[PDB]
Amino acid sequence: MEVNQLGLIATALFVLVPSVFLIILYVQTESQQ
Amino acid sequence: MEVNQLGLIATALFVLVPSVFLIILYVQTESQQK
Amino acid sequence: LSYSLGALSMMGFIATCFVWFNNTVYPSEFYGPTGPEASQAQAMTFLIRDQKLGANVGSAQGPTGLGKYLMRSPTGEIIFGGETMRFWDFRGPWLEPLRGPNGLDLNKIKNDIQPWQERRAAEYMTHAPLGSLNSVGGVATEINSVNFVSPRSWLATSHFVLAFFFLVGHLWHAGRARAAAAGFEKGIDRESEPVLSMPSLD
Amino acid sequence: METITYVFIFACIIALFFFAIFFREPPRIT
Amino acid sequence: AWKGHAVFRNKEGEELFVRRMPAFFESFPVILTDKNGVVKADIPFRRAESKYSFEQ
Amino acid sequence: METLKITVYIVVTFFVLLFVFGFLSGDPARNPKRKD
Amino acid sequence: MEPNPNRQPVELNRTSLYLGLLLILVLALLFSSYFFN
Amino acid sequence: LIYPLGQSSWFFAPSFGVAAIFRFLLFFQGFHNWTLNPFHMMGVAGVLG
Amino acid sequence: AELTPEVLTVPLNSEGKTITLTEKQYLEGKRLFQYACASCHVGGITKTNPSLDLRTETLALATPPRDNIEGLVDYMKNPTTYDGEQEIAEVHPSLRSADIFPKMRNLTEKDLVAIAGHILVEPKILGDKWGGGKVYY
Amino acid sequence: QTLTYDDIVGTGLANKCPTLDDTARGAYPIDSSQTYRIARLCLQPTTFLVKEEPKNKRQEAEFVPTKLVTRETTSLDQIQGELKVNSDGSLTFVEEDGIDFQPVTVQMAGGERIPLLFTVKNLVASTQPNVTSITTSTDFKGEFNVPSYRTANFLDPKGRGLASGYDSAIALPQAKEEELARANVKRFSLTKGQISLNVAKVDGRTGEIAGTFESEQLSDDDMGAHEPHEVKIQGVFYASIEPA
Amino acid sequence: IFGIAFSNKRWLHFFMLFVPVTGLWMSAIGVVGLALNLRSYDFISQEIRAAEDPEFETFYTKNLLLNEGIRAWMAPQDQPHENFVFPEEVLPRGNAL
Amino acid sequence: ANLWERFCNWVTSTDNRLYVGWFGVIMIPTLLAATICFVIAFIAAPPVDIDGIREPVSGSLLYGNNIITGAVVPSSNAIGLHFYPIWEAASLDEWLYNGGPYQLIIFHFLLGASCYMGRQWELSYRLGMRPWICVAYSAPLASAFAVFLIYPIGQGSFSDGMPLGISGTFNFMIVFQAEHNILMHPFHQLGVAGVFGGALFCAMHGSLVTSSLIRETTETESANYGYKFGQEEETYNIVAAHGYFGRLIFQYASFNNSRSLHFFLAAWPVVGVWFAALGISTMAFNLNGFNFNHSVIDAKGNVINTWADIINRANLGMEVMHERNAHNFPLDLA
Amino acid sequence: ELVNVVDEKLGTAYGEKIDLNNTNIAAFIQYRGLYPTLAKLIVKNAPYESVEDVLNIPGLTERQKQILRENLEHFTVTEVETALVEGGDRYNNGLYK
Ligand code: CLA
Ligand code: CLA
Ligand code: CLA
Ligand SMILES: CC(C)=CCC/C(C)=C/CC/C(C)=C/CC/C(C)=C/CC/C(C)=C/CC/C(C)=C/CC/C(C)=C/CC/C(C)=C/CC/C(C)=C/CC1=CC(=O)C(C)=C(C)C1=O
Ligand SMILES: CC(C)=CCC/C(C)=C/CC/C(C)=C\CC/C(C)=C/CC/C(C)=C/CC/C(C)=C/CC/C(C)=C/CC/C(C)=C/CC/C(C)=C/CC1=CC(=O)C(C)=C(C)C1=O
Ligand SMILES: CCCCCCCCCCCCCCCC(=O)OC[C@H](COP(=O)(O)OC[C@@H](O)CO)OC(=O)CCCCCCCCCCCCCCC
Ligand SMILES: CCCCCCCCCCCCCCCC(=O)OC[C@H](COP(=O)(O)OC[C@@H](O)CO)OC(=O)CCCCCCCCCCCCCCC
Ligand code: HEC
Ligand SMILES: CCCCCCCCCCCCO[C@@H]1O[C@H](CO)[C@@H](O[C@H]2O[C@H](CO)[C@@H](O)[C@H](O)[C@H]2O)[C@H](O)[C@H]1O
Ligand SMILES: CCCCCCCCCCCCO[C@@H]1O[C@H](CO)[C@@H](O[C@H]2O[C@H](CO)[C@@H](O)[C@H](O)[C@H]2O)[C@H](O)[C@H]1O
Ligand SMILES: CCCCCCCS[C@@H]1O[C@H](CO)[C@@H](O)[C@H](O)[C@H]1O
Ligand code: OEX
Ligand SMILES: [Ca+2]
Ligand SMILES: [Cl-]
Ligand SMILES: [Cl-]
């Protein structure tokens, strides 16, 4: 199908950028105290 | 130019995945009890 | 009481299907045609009309490639075409004279359709059980003119509603009867809360 | 690539269910 | 490039005007009227009872 | 297909029997309070 | 249930972060031309 | 307010009535394909949720 | 706009005589048409044969002509195909076949005139809606 | 011993042609002064073969087996027509009417579905000369018409058709039309098929015959959107011959 | 029963505010787009495939045909200032209906 | 004890991380079967001839769909209400063409979800709870029965059941409006009151409890840490919340009894959705929404349109276009 | 060049008169006396090399011939178009009201 060629990286960064933000914050909470 | 259409996401994940691995490890080191 | 409520709910669902499909103990002379019946009667009506005009209804190919008037069921029986293909299990006294061993019989269709069958098919096609809550007969887009909702629709809808609420009543009273017999229908005893004596899930 | 993407996201969600259920932070009466 | 202004005429030589698409419509029929808004030609959907086809 | 049909019939029968015999196995008594 | 005595904290100091990001970014600057081809 | 202000006139705002609002729903389906819109879908999830 | 005597004036026969129906006749005609005919002819179409409608222009080209009171009254006694060639009382409601179409059993000559008047007046009110089908709803 | 509709319904027998016993090896005399008709012709397909579309023209393509996916809806039946005695003693069946077509979809290895209008519409089929009696050595060979699988009102999923529908790709209002012409302009196919009927059994007393058939015809071309496939249909047939 | 459960009553009741309030806010953003006819009307990849392949059909293309019927059949009376006159022959209709 | 007793004790055990129970022994296999078939079909099933006219509709991702357009497509109109298990097909290829996955999925789902409801009764009993959470769940459950089973029965075909997909759902809704004028039906209107009202009261209750949380935390921590799981004291001041809401409207329009309040929160959406389900289930037998087409007439007899007549024009557009190759005769009678 | 043959036929006499070789049978209702008795005979005995050949239908009564003679001005004949005559479409072409 003739899909938008930027859709793949749009979807990938849409997932990865906020997910890694949350993982960073979670892991550094676990490592506290 | 007729570049490989996967080159963009290949480069983006090549940077992002290991960089994020290191940032996770760094930040949780800083937050450990001093 | 809860046992009987479950029984009556089941019976209500059964009666709903009885009045919707069965035309023996709910004769169509009195209750109107069934939904399947009226749809079959429409196909019969235009088969009769177009055949009178000269159409060879056995060899007439419809737009999809299926027969416009006649086609095969998934097991080969000759049945009416169009959307009424779904209703080929229908049986009724105005239609059975046209049925032979392999289903609807083309020679009987060509030669043996009587005026009373044309009348009954026209009557049932135009009293199909479709109509509005304020009793405007016909499809939802039809204009006001005909005051009609089939008794089959009134009886089917009313008894589904009642059967459903009686299923709810069964669950209500069955669950309450269990809780009352075991002694906690009024709530948890603060000094004897069962979950507090159970091991943690994790 | 579209189908892979859709099925990948779905697979991540199902894995998330597994962790959210069996590796939840346990509820503790304080 | 502009192709130029299209003037539509029927076999009797009357000028006809294509009904323009309003912004609301993703798609729109093709209907031609005379200067007084009377329909004179169109592109039919069903053909069997067409009266206004460009061919006719 | 015939083997599939027989297999499913056996599977369904198995689980239905578990359901029926399970609820016949003194279910009112399986509560935290009064057992009767 | 009893905790696992083999667990260890993990560390990455700031210099190692900078060295690692330099490695990743320079590797990307090098290989990206071949990814686009 | 915003929707009719973007359109040609107040005419295409919802009229204040039961059947008039139903017409508004069906207009949005036929002209805007509003069921396909992910912002409507999130609205549905929020209301039903 | 009003339901005037002019609106209620319709052809009595093929020879130029008119008859002016009363408002009570018009109301009776609407009631009787719904009672005996609308199950197939709602809005002036024909559900079991949509090629033939009740438009006045269609009735005028029927054989014998049906665009007048006498023609319509005769049709309800002894209906024919559009070319007049076949009598169809056996499949169309009529006084002749009131035995098999029981709703015709109690229709009087006065009732048939009212039904005929309804069929002729209604397109004068509704225009293309009469016999137009869903396109004009 | 005579089965009713309720005996047959749902069994699959309604899609099967009548058979004759192994004892039916007789001969049915033809009176050259008598007129005859076929009161019932039935064709029950048992195999659908599709000719593969090869990349190499030096390679001779073969007919390969297929899987029927539209169930027991395939047989032609209740067909009738004149059975003429020609001056040279050959017989010619002229098909008049009947359930003489079935849409059929078969599926090739790998998933490609092949719709066709399996048919003997307007069949004219003749025996060899000097057929004084129909016997197990009698054969019928003839041609028939294969009209478009969809008729002229059929609308595609974007609403385009021949006698109805849009005449353009309305979802692409400013696309160039030339590349879409084959999909936009619907065309109605009409081709010929060929069939052979091999008589294998004859009941001289009843005028019934049965045997095997093979027919060849083109499949659906989707109202001109793509090329049809060549199909070969094999099966059994039954016919009842009567003085007319 | 479900695998997860609330354990914090303050979170539970904040979540009850958050969910419907956020949903209505999202629907409002879509309507702001429709003010400008900035619709999610089509999937371009679907339309390109369907235009070239008259056997390709999904529920998405089926609903567009419904929309086309809605527009043509309701517009003359619903938009009287446009003075639409759509001759019978141009109205989109399937077979028979 | 004996193996059957130990088995029964494990099945009904209150200590399993997920409760099994006797309803669960039917629920778990049926829901796994429906889930696995759904996922595989959604990804990889070939097109399905939903309307029995040899016009297969593609539902799966690999066959050209995205998440929004994809579906598991209902079984063929040629099947109608006939039971079409895998072993009734000559081959899987035939089963797939005719929409076999849809019947397998909805029948296993409906059975499994019915057992989910019974399982909610069962665990409440084992835990010493009151029993009626399962009655609240009967409202969405009845709605699923309405669109997957009752509507097909009334119309005579599973091809008219709701498709298992996002755009297929919209298709079902639009066709339903054309054929039943559901928007003008009071049971659907009660349904809307139920879900609009449910969302309203959800936001209301959430906002009122959140507004009266008792101060237990500092400015730099989430107020949620002010509540501890299992504490005996209430975590908000219901007297303050009622004092607010009773002044927002008037005193007697506000709940001061938490039990009354939460009963209302349960009953309003549950009853409204019951009527929604009954709307679909009775329009299944063609008792349709109010029809006021040409209800207003002037002194001569001209039709004076109302908004109902405009609705009618939209419905007609849906009617004449839906299933554009399936109707040969002038009336759509099912 | 690809051509829609029905649109093409609308530019011939088929788009102006009742084509005895092609037109669907309901068109004979336009004129007095043709439907259904003559209309059936005309469609059954089609095609015709000229309009006047309709008078040669075997079995026509003298009154039927008179009616046909009065209506020859409303008839035409063109080449049989497969797309208009297959599917029994001359007896029912999928159009009602
Ligand atoms: C508003 C309340 C209400 C009303 C008005 C009705 C009304 C009706 N119901 Mg419904 N029903 C209801 C609620 C209601 N129901 C509820 C809550 C349930 C449980 C969900 C049901 C379950 C139900 C079922 C299962 C059926 C009905 C049926 C009917 C119809 C026939 C009733 C009948 O004959 O009963 C029977 C009467 C009795 C049992 C009393 C005794 C009758 C004796 C035995 C008769 C003997 C007759 C014999 C000829 C005499 C010969 C003697 C000889 C010597 C000469 C009637 C329209 C029937 C129907 O038509 O289905 C659509 C049907 O099958 N109802
Ligand atoms: C099984 C029960 C049943 C059925 C199928 C019918 C069917 C019919 N009735 Mg009868 N009738 C009934 C019971 C029933 N009735 C009862 C209980 C009474 C006493 C009130 C009557 C008195 C009666 C009269 C006086 C008339 C009829 C008429 C009719 C006909 C037209 C109905 C109409 O227009 O409804 C209109 C529709 C409504 C009024 C909608 C009802 C919606 C209710 C409120 C929904 C209820 C849901 C549920 C029960 C509530 C649950 C609450 C929840 C929180 C648990 C139709 C054949 C008419 C007729 O034509 O007679 C020849 C007529 O004039 N009926
Ligand atoms: C599953 C079915 C479903 C669900 C749950 C929804 C849910 C929603 N729809 Mg969608 N819709 C659907 C199907 C659905 N829709 C379909 C199939 C279509 C066809 C495309 C639509 C077409 C549609 C349109 C055209 C619109 C919606 C909108 C909405 C949102 C309305 C929120 C609201 O409460 O406004 C209600 C109104 C308010 C909350 C405004 C404030 C009201 C004040 C406070 C009232 C005060 C009253 C006062 C006291 C006086 C009372 C007097 C009394 C006598 C009456 C909500 C997300 C609306 C939207 O997206 O808005 C952004 C909208 O415009 N929908
Ligand atoms: C093979 C493939 C690819 C298959 C996929 C096919 C397919 C079609 C997938 C579907 C894709 C999909 C999911 C689409 C939906 C997309 C969509 C519209 C998303 C909306 C996103 C969004 C941000 C919307 C904005 C509005 C919003 C915030 C909505 C949130 C809705 C939401 C999560 C509501 C909560 C629902 C829910 C089940 C809550 C459970 C809560 C719970 C455990 C209560 C139990 C409970 C109650 C008590 O009272 C107490 C006291 C306790 C203690 C307790 O426990
Ligand atoms: C220029 C000029 C003239 C100026 C004059 C200014 C002036 C002085 C004015 C004076 C006023 C005056 C004289 C006249 C006023 C004129 C007038 C009549 C205006 C009309 C305004 C109007 C139409 C208002 C309508 C709005 C209204 C009353 C809506 C009622 C809605 C409704 C259904 C309410 C309550 C029903 C109900 C059961 C709600 C429960 C909801 C719910 C579950 C809440 C959850 C909940 C509830 C609790 O309860 C508590 C505890 C908690 C925990 C909790 O979760
Ligand atoms: C398919 C799934 C894929 C998953 C993703 C995998 C992520 C892999 C991430 C690997 C990143 C590792 C980087 C660690 C970087 C890092 O931590 O370095 C510092 C580290 C020092 O270690 P120490 O023993 O001092 O420990 C300190 C601790 O805090 C480290 O954790 O040395 C090494 O790791 C030795 C090898 C790397 C030496 C690399 C130096 C490169 C110099 C710059 C080169 C570029 C410029 C060239 C110009 C010509
Ligand atoms: C028979 C077995 C049935 C098992 C079915 C599997 C159920 C899966 C349930 C959700 C698991 C993931 C939850 C993660 C999140 C999680 O772990 O939450 C756990 C959380 C626990 O809340 P607490 O009160 O303990 O947390 C309080 C404080 O920690 C907040 O800081 O629960 C909620 O918040 C309930 C409200 C959200 C409920 C979300 C429901 C989502 C339903 C699924 C929707 C998406 C479907 C997409 C399909 C493609
Ligand atoms: C369906 C069961 C019908 C009912 C009830 C009534 N009519 Fe009818 N009508 C019906 C058909 C199938 C036809 C065509 C018959 C044919 O083969 O020609 C008709 C025709 C008429 C006509 C002639 C229309 C024309 O254009 O010439 C008239 C005047 C007519 N019908 C009147 C009429 C009246 C007054 C009725 C109630 C008393 C009535 N019809 C009932 C089908 C049905
Ligand atoms: C569909 C086919 C099934 C039809 C069965 C019809 C029922 C006819 C009688 C069957 C009786 C079943 O027998 C039932 O199972 C076993 C057999 O000892 C018993 O065993 C049970 O007893 C006690 C009751 O407190 C339970 O706590 C215990 O865990 C359980 O093992 C049940 O007490 C008995 O009632
Ligand atoms: C798309 C790319 C994704 C890449 C994802 C990479 C994931 C990397 C995960 C790193 C996990 C770190 O694991 C984390 O280790 C720290 C110590 O280091 C643990 O922390 C533990 O030790 C520290 C330090 O003594 C204590 O202060 C703390 O109280 C204790 O819990 C955490 O309990 C654990 O969660
Ligand atoms: C683990 C289950 C994987 C799902 C299997 C999908 C069906 S199998 C699939 O069928 C296609 C269509 O016939 C073929 O073209 C393809 O070659 C084949 O792999
Ligand atoms: O299939 Mn689905 O939709 Ca219930 O209506 Mn008839 O059928 Mn079809 O048309 Mn309309
Ligand atoms: Ca031989
Ligand atoms: Cl559709
Ligand atoms: Cl149909």
Short mmCIF file of C-alpha atoms in Angstrom, two decimals, chain J residues 83 89-93 125-129 131 133-142 195-200 202 209-213 237:
data_model
loop_
_atom_site.label_atom_id
_atom_site.label_comp_id
_atom_site.label_asym_id
_atom_site.label_seq_id
_atom_site.Cartn_x
_atom_site.Cartn_y
_atom_site.Cartn_z
CA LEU J 83 -33.40 -32.46 -29.53
CA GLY J 89 -28.85 -38.79 -38.65
CA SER J 90 -26.90 -36.76 -36.10
CA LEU J 91 -28.78 -35.25 -33.16
CA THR J 92 -28.47 -31.63 -32.00
CA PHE J 93 -29.53 -30.46 -28.55
CA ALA J 125 -24.45 -29.68 -28.91
CA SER J 126 -24.40 -32.40 -31.57
CA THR J 127 -23.64 -36.10 -31.91
CA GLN J 128 -21.88 -37.92 -34.73
CA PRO J 129 -23.91 -38.65 -37.89
CA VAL J 131 -27.29 -41.99 -34.64
CA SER J 133 -30.05 -45.13 -31.35
CA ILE J 134 -28.48 -43.40 -28.36
CA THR J 135 -25.95 -45.85 -26.89
CA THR J 136 -22.91 -45.82 -24.62
CA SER J 137 -20.91 -44.88 -27.75
CA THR J 138 -22.88 -41.66 -28.32
CA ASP J 139 -21.16 -38.33 -27.64
CA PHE J 140 -22.35 -34.71 -27.70
CA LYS J 141 -20.03 -31.83 -28.53
CA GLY J 142 -20.96 -28.18 -28.64
CA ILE J 195 -18.24 -28.85 -23.89
CA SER J 196 -18.14 -32.59 -24.52
CA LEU J 197 -20.67 -35.05 -23.10
CA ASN J 198 -19.66 -38.73 -23.05
CA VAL J 199 -22.64 -41.08 -22.63
CA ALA J 200 -21.79 -43.94 -20.25
CA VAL J 202 -28.53 -45.65 -21.21
CA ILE J 209 -28.86 -41.29 -20.16
CA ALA J 210 -25.91 -40.47 -17.93
CA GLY J 211 -22.18 -40.02 -18.29
CA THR J 212 -19.23 -37.68 -17.89
CA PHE J 213 -18.62 -34.21 -19.28
CA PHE J 237 -24.30 -35.50 -16.28
#
